[PDB]
């Protein structure tokens, strides 16, 4: 059962920094099947990324995903104020879904 | 959501072939991308897939060695190298986009045919045997027919012997000419485009399949067989 | 392409629950559709999962013996039934498209919040 | 007079083997020499010719530009290199004498197989339809069969139509789901190693081939095909 | 006595392609050599000749000012090259020996099939106007149908008045909205695939073709007309 | 509010055209401008679109890679340029504003005619084939009419067998000499403008399709066929 | 439970024959019997049908006023009286127990053949006119045939023109005789077994059903027409 | 897991022979390995055995002496190498996995056909 | 040296039918350590039935071996077409493994 590890568990930034999230699983991730989603206070999940480095249609550049196998990464690029939110990586590659903990960007 | 293919045509045997077909309306560098073929009034056959770059690409047993599959996803272009090619590849070739579980193969190009061939406008000469099959005993005649879609120049039509797990024994040549150590139980006649082989008693060791064959032109063709059983 | 979510509220330990999922916008009858929660101030979890005919149906392991999903194609609606409800089942529950290497959870519900409490 | 014949096996696809074949009793350096095969349960085919020097040496389409024949007539020997092999060269090879008037194919080697083969000794899912043909009215019902060899993992089944001189169109997929834009009178259902394709009341343009296909491993199948008039 | 061809294949409109045809068997630097093509389920279709230096080189109609025929007696070959190609283009092409008294096309190429498609399909909405011709007096009641082969969205379905030697004018637009300016007496209904053009009262005026039109998507398709007589 | 429209006329096959449309009474830079087209006695039909700054612009499958659509806001100028004109592009063409949801296509230009041909005639000898169909027994005899517009000079008129894939087989030639192969079965006759051939005693090899040819002049013709089924 | 059927036989045309069905195991007075039949080679066929004393005797519109349906319950005996007995009885006849829903014909009697013939046949000599069907313009060639399986003696063989609702009309006779009145672009010919109506150029009023008619011998027969539309 | 044969063909008596099998699939190493042949129109007939380094490889009576089973697990690769061939040896070859009390000759090769003719 | 004994050396039966194949060894297999192969022609053998009675995985439920000892049993209750080939018993009980003579089934 495949565990995703989010760090750091909380990001405090100021808007145009860049946020650096690392999402770690326990085991490889087959065909790279991850996917990171944002949620702001009370609204469902948002897809960003998907196939590890997929951009959804209408998410901005400025999201980026990579990595393969354990170790995957999120970037934004310059941060705006309406990306301060909390942020999930997801694996679909078994039969027995699992998400990360999340990483609050503040 | 469409596949344009192009390429193909009529080739040498031997020869070399690129075939290609280019996706728009998706995202072309996620999904997995197989070529598909069918031989004139046969069925469908798998030939070679690809994947992303973390993948292998997998061919046919029929195409391994010789075709190579590839793609450049900044053209959303997928590719067949065909090298080698021969008489068995000759069929209509298909790019198709496979979905799996979200739809197999849901998307197909048009198609483009593939013939290697390094002959003329005329066909070869065509040898039926009939009847397929006869079951007969010990003692009885039996009476197998050849027949050629062309005359057969200078009676040039011979008839073999096989046995199962044995090659090919002569026994007529010339239409009607004894082989050396042959039974004079077995005696060929006809002309032109009509060829009989008669066994006149048939003993236990005559149970084999019989084949006709002329040998008239460059071009050697053998029937199809009739089996004695 | 939007899926319409239904259900919910306060409920008794030991009560019982139907979430609905109107969906609209796309092949509803031939989609993998999934339900997810999330407990207050916790991270999202894969609840259940149901796709085509001839395809298993999937539950975590939490909810397996208690929570029932199913499909009615014909009205394009996913449901969850949800038996034998305590206090851990509190959460918010969304129903999502889920579109594997085409866009994982590309499609999410608005979300239903289910309050297990006496 | 005697054809030693040696070599064959099993061979990867993409691979090279090299066929020998050793006479005596006769004058080898005159003679002309000529390769046949013949595929598991098939008939009789020319492969390749070679004779004086002189002459042409002459090639079936089937093998033209991959293969060799060649002779070394100071050690009465007929060779054969055969490259970048492909399974529908998998066949029993014989060397033979070629007399034309004076015996045709009269000497036989005793014939060497050659198999072209990447897989183990499972074999590949076998898709078996049934039956093979549908005559059938407009508005009346088609009842098409899929029988698997082994069961298809996951229901991981699909269907096609397809019209005379059109690419095949996905009509289901995962055995029971039908793609977008398919009209209703088409359904899928079944499981395991049993599937049925039901059309509930034909309509004129439902008249093609349907061909059933499984992906649930890495060597995809199709069945044969049904044709419904 | 043969003709080998290579070449053809599927290109894409506007593309360029060049036959090949090698001669064997007869001079062929003295011969009168043709081009014929057949598209598919069509007839028989003259190209293009050549012929002996000091001879002319005839061109069909349709393919003057595209086509190009050649020859190289060097090496027996003969070329034909195709530019600026079309669906009209799509054929088996043919090369032939032209004997005149002696025996007309007596010798012919196997031929190459040439496709000329940017696509492959199909997928468009279909739309069918019935009936084709209604004869109907002043003061009748014309009703058209318009069916759609899927759902037109939105209704977003026209329809068109054209007179001979006119451009089309707007009746009804959204399936149910009269054109500014449109008598009363026409009236457009239905939804999904069925729609309806209600012509009240027949004027003498209102005598002449009606075309229905979907554009709910990116690919715009008109019904083939109803003619009011 | 209207669309002047310009250009076209008569050009020859592989040309080239530009055809322009001038609004006036509309915002035109906020519009989406089409070209509709309809062929001679035929229905309309879509051609290309194009829209805002940020153009997504579009064909039909036949013209891509032949037209380009294009417009100059600042002159309030809609454009099609045409290149690789043939036979089959030769309409009336109309520039429309589409409306959309508010109108479909409510402004037409008056159309411009686009003629593509190499000369006026099609001044060539017509040859009738009788019937198009026959349905016969084997054994029975076929007799296939071939009547002529003109006089057919020297009797040079040719028949040839088509099989089904295959090229066309010579059968007779200068009205009624045999080629060389043909059985005795196959005899034509006639002279001026009525030849017949006639299979006197239909063998199962004999279904096919047979076409009459004149080459009495510089302009080959062909039959459109008879089928014998 | 049981059904003992006697009865039938072979007997001439207009002729009678009485069936019987014994029956035991079950209270046959309260059960209603059934007669059914089945043509050679053809479907069953409901006849008649007995039941309580106080219900109506029901027949099929083919028998009814020839056939009678009766039963003797101190007998435990069905019987089917058949007069005017025509070839067109020719069946299989079987008595059944009616159960309706309990069980419908769940007790049928084993059959027994009932067969009315006059002693066919035979010796007449079959005509067989091809094609079925020509589908021709005015002013082209119509060939018609007439084959027979015996030879003609003296040629004694006529053809006939039909338009619908009138009678035929006599076009040739003595195979090559072209009756009074008939315009000279019909003409027969023929000998033996093969014999041949030829319209030379049609005109509009020749567009009918065509017979020939052998009046050889006592037995006078007609082939079954070629319709020239 | 899959056994890929290869070798076999037409020799001469006295002549020598080296049949393949390359196993994919599972753990090669571990696994115990058998050549078995099949003389045409007859039975089955076990050949020879190899396991692990240490353990004894074993022969039939007709082949001990001419025969020699090995091994390559770095290439995860079977061999038979077949001397002194007579046209007794004239069989169908196959190799296969043996899996004992959990599954016997459960995974076989597809057999290559060795003929010894003069 | 155990040998294995199977009859009948040919069963011609008919597709419904029950074929019932016999097994019998010279000595007791130890543990019933044998196994069931079915061949058809041109193809290699394949497991049916081992350990006596265990019926491989993908095997249908038609097939089912008995006995113990030194008689032993493979029946197919309801033979279908695809089940017309030769039957081979195994035994692996010892270092030299042998085979029965084999069973047609036709």
């Known amino acids: 059962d495949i565990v995703l590890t989010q760090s750091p568990a909380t990001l405090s930034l100021s808007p145009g920094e860049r946020a650096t999230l690392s999402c770690r699983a326990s085991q490889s991730v087959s065909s790279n099947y991850l996917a990171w989603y944002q949620q702001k206070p009370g609204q469902a999940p948002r897809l960003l990324i998907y196939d590890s480095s997929s951009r959804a249609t209408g998410v901005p550049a400025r999201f980026s995903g990579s990595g393969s196998g354990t170790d995957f990464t999120l970037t934004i690029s310059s941060l705006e104020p309406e990306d301060f939110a909390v942020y999930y990586c997801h694996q679909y590659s078994d039969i027995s879904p699992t998400f990360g903990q999340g990483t609050k960007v503040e | 959501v469409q596949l344009v293919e192009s390429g193909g045509g009529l080739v040498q045997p031997g020869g070399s072939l690129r075939l290609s077909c280019?996706?728009?309306?998706?995202?072309?560098?996620?999904?997995?991308?197989?070529?598909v073929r069918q031989a004139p009034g046969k069925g469908l056959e798998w030939?070679?897939?690809?994947?992303?770059?973390?993948?292998?690409?997998?061919?046919?047993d029929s195409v391994k060695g010789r075709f190579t599959i590839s793609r450049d996803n900044s053209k959303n272009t997928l590719y067949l190298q065909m090298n080698s090619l021969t008489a068995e590849d000759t069929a209509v070739?298909?790019?198709?986009?496979?979905?799996?579980?979200?739809?197999?193969?849901?998307?197909?190009?048009?198609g483009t045919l593939v013939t290697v061939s390094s002959g003329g406008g005329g066909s070869d000469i065509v040898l039926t045997q009939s009847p397929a099959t006869l079951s007969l005993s010990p003692g009885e005649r039996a009476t197998l027919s050849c027949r050629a879609s062309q005359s057969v120049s200078s009676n040039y039509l011979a008839w073999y012997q096989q046995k199962p797990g044995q090659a090919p024994r002569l026994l007529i040549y010339d239409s009607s000419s004894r082989a050396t150590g042959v039974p004079a139980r077995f005696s060929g006649s006809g002309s032109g485009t009509d060829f009989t082989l008669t066994i006149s008693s048939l003993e236990p060791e005559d149970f084999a399949v019989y084949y006709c064959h002329q040998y008239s032109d460059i071009s050697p063709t053998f029937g199809q067989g009739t089996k004695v059983e | 392409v939007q899926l319409v979510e239904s259900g919910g509220g306060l409920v008794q330990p030991g009560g019982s629950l139907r979430l609905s999922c109107?969906?609209?916008?796309?092949?509803?009858?031939?989609?993998?559709?999934?339900?997810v929660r999330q407990a207050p101030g916790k991270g999202l979890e894969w609840?259940?999962?149901?796709?085509?005919?001839?395809?298993?149906?999937?539950?975590?392991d939490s909810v397996k013996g208690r929570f029932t999903i199913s499909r009615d194609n014909s009205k394009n609606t996913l449901y969850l039934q949800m038996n034998s409800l305590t206090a851990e089942d509190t959460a918010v529950?969304?129903?999502?498209?889920?579109?594997?290497?085409?866009?994982?959870?590309?499609?999410?519900?608005?979300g239903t919040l289910v309050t297990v409490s006496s | 007079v005697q054809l030693v014949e040696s070599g064959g096996g099993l061979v990867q696809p993409g691979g090279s083997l090299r066929l020998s074949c050793?006479?005596?009793?006769?004058?080898?350096?005159?003679?002309?020499?000529?390769?046949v095969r013949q595929a598991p349960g098939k008939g009789l085919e020319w492969?390749?010719?070679?004779?004086?020097?002189?002459?042409?040496?002459?090639?079936?389409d089937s093998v033209k530009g991959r293969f060799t024949i060649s002779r070394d007539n100071s050690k009465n020997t007929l060779y054969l290199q055969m490259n970048s092999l492909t399974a529908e060269d998998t066949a029993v090879?014989?060397?033979?004498?070629?007399?034309?008037?004076?015996?045709?194919?009269?000497?036989?080697?005793?014939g060497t197989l050659v198999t072209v083969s990447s897989g183990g000794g499972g074999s590949d899912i076998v898709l078996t339809q049934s039956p093979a043909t549908l005559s059938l009215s407009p508005g009346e019902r088609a009842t098409l069969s899929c029988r698997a060899s082994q069961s298809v993992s996951s229901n991981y089944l699909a269907w096609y139509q397809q019209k005379p001189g059109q690419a095949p169109r996905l009509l289901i997929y995962d055995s029971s789901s039908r793609a977008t834009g398919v009209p209703a009178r088409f359904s899928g259902s079944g499981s395991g190693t049993d599937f049925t394709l039901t059309i509930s009341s034909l309509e004129p343009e439902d008249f093609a081939v349907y061909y059933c296909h499984q992906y649930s491993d890495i060597s995809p199948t199709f069945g044969q095909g049904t044709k419904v008039e | 006595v043969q003709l080998v061809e290579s070449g053809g294949g599927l290109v894409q409109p506007g593309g360029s392609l060049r036959l090949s045809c090698?001669?064997?068997?007869?001079?062929?630097?003295?011969?009168?050599?043709?081009?014929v093509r057949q598209a598919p389920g069509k007839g028989l279709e003259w190209?293009?000749?050549?012929?002996?230096?000091?001879?002319?080189?005839?061109?069909?109609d349709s393919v003057k000012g595209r086509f190009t025929i050649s020859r190289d007696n060097s090496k027996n070959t003969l070329y034909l090259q195709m530019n600026s190609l079309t669906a009209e283009d799509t054929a088996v092409?043919?090369?032939?020996?032209?004997?005149?008294?002696?025996?007309?096309?007596?010798?012919?190429?196997?031929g190459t099939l040439v496709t000329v498609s940017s696509g492959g399909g199909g997928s468009d909405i279909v739309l069918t106007q019935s009936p084709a011709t209604l004869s109907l007096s002043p003061g009748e009641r014309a009703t058209l149908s318009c069916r759609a082969s899927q759902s037109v969205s939105s209704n977003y379905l026209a329809w068109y008045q054209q007179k001979p030697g006119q451009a089309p004018r707007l009746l009804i637009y959204d399936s149910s909205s009269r054109a500014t300016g449109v008598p009363a007496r026409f009236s457009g209904s239905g939804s999904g695939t069925d729609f309806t053009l209600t012509i009240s009262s027949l004027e003498p005026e209102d005598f002449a073709v009606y075309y229905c039109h979907q554009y709910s998507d990116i690919s715009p398709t008109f019904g083939q007309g109803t003619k009011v007589e | 509010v209207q669309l002047v429209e310009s250009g076209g006329g008569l050009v020859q096959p592989g040309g080239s055209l530009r055809l322009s449309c001038?609004?006036?009474?509309?915002?035109?830079?906020?519009?989406?401008?089409?070209?509709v087209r309809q062929a001679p006695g035929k229905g309309l039909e879509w051609?290309?679109?194009?829209?805002?700054?940020?153009?997504?612009?579009?064909?039909?499958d036949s013209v891509k890679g032949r037209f380009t659509i294009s417009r100059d806001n600042s002159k309030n100028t809609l454009y099609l340029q045409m290149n690789s004109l043939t036979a089959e592009d030769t309409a009336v063409?109309?520039?429309?504003?589409?409306?959309?949801?508010?109108?479909?296509?409510?402004?037409?230009?008056?159309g411009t005619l686009v003629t593509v041909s190499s000369g006026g005639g099609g001044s060539d000898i017509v040859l009738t084939q009788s019937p198009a169909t026959l349905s016969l027994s084997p054994g029975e005899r076929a007799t296939l009419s071939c009547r002529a517009s003109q006089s057919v000079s020297s009797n040079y008129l040719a028949w040839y067998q088509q099989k089904p894939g295959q090229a066309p087989r010579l059968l007779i030639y200068d009205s009624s000499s045999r080629a060389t192969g043909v059985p005795a079965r196959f005899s034509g006759s006639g002279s001026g403008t009525d030849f017949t051939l006639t299979i006197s005693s239909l063998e199962p090899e004999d279904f096919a399709v047979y076409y009459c040819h004149q080459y009495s002049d510089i302009s080959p013709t062909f039959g459109q066929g008879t089928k014998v089924e | 439970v049981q059904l003992v059927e006697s009865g039938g036989g072979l007997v001439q045309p207009g002729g009678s024959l009485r069936l019987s069905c014994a029956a035991s195991?079950?209270?046959?007075?309260?059960?209603?019997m059934h007669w059914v039949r089945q043509a050679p080679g053809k479907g069953l066929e409901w006849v008649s049908s007995?039941?309580?004393?106080?219900?109506?005797?029901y027949y099929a519109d083919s028998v009814k006023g020839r056939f009678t349906i009766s039963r003797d319950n101190s007998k435990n005996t069905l019987y089917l009286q058949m007069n005017s007995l025509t070839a067109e009885d020719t069946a299989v006849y079987y008595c059944?127990?009616?159960?309706?829903?309990?069980?419908?014909?769940?007790?049928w009697g084993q059959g027994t053949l009932v067969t009315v013939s006059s002693g066919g046949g035979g010796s007449d000599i079959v005509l067989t006119q091809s094609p079925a069907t020509l589908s021709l313009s005015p002013g082209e060639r119509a060939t018609l045939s007439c084959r027979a399986s015996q030879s003609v003696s003296s040629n004694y063989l006529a053809w006939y023109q039909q338009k619908p609702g009138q009678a035929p009309r006599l076009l040739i006779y003595d195979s090559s005789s072209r009756a009074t009145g008939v315009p000279a672009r019909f003409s027969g010919s023929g000998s033996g077994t093969d014999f041949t109506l030829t319209i030379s150029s049609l005109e509009p009023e020749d567009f009918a059903v065509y017979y020939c008619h052998q009046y050889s011998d006592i037995s006078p027969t007609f082939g079954q027409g070629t319709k020239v539309e | 897991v899959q056994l890929v044969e290869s070798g076999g063909g037409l020799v001469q008596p006295g002549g020598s022979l080296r049949l393949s099998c390359?196993?994919?699939?599972?753990?090669?190493?571990?696994?115990?390995?058998?050549?078995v042949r099949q003389a045409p129109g007859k039975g089955l007939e076990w050949?020879?055995?190899?396991?692990?380094?240490?353990?004894?490889?074993?022969?039939?009576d007709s082949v001990k002496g001419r025969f020699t089973i090995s091994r390559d697990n770095s290439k995860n690769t079977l061999y038979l190498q077949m001397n002194s061939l007579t046209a007794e040896d004239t069989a169908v070859?196959?190799?296969?996995?043996?899996?004992?009390?959990?599954?016997?000759?459960?995974?076989?090769?597809?057999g290559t056909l060795v003929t010894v003719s003069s | 040296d155990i040998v294995l004994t199977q009859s009948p050396a040919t069963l011609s039966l008919s597709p419904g039918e029950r074929a019932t194949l016999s097994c019998r060894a010279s000595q007791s297999v130890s543990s019933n350590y044998l196994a069931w192969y079915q061949q058809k022609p041109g193809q290699a053998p394949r497991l049916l039935i081992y350990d006596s009675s265990s019926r491989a995985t993908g095997v249908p439920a038609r097939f089912s071996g008995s006995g113990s000892g030194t008689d032993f049993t493979l029946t197919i209750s309801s033979l279908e077409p695809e089940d017309f080939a030769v039957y081979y018993c195994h035994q692996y009980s010892d270092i030299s493994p042998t085979f029965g003579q084999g069973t047609k089934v036709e």
């Open positions: 059944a127990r009616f159960a309706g829903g309990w069980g419908a014909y769940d007790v």
């Open positions: 195991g079950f209270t046959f007075r309260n059960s209603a």
């Open positions: 007995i039941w309580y004393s106080g219900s109506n005797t």
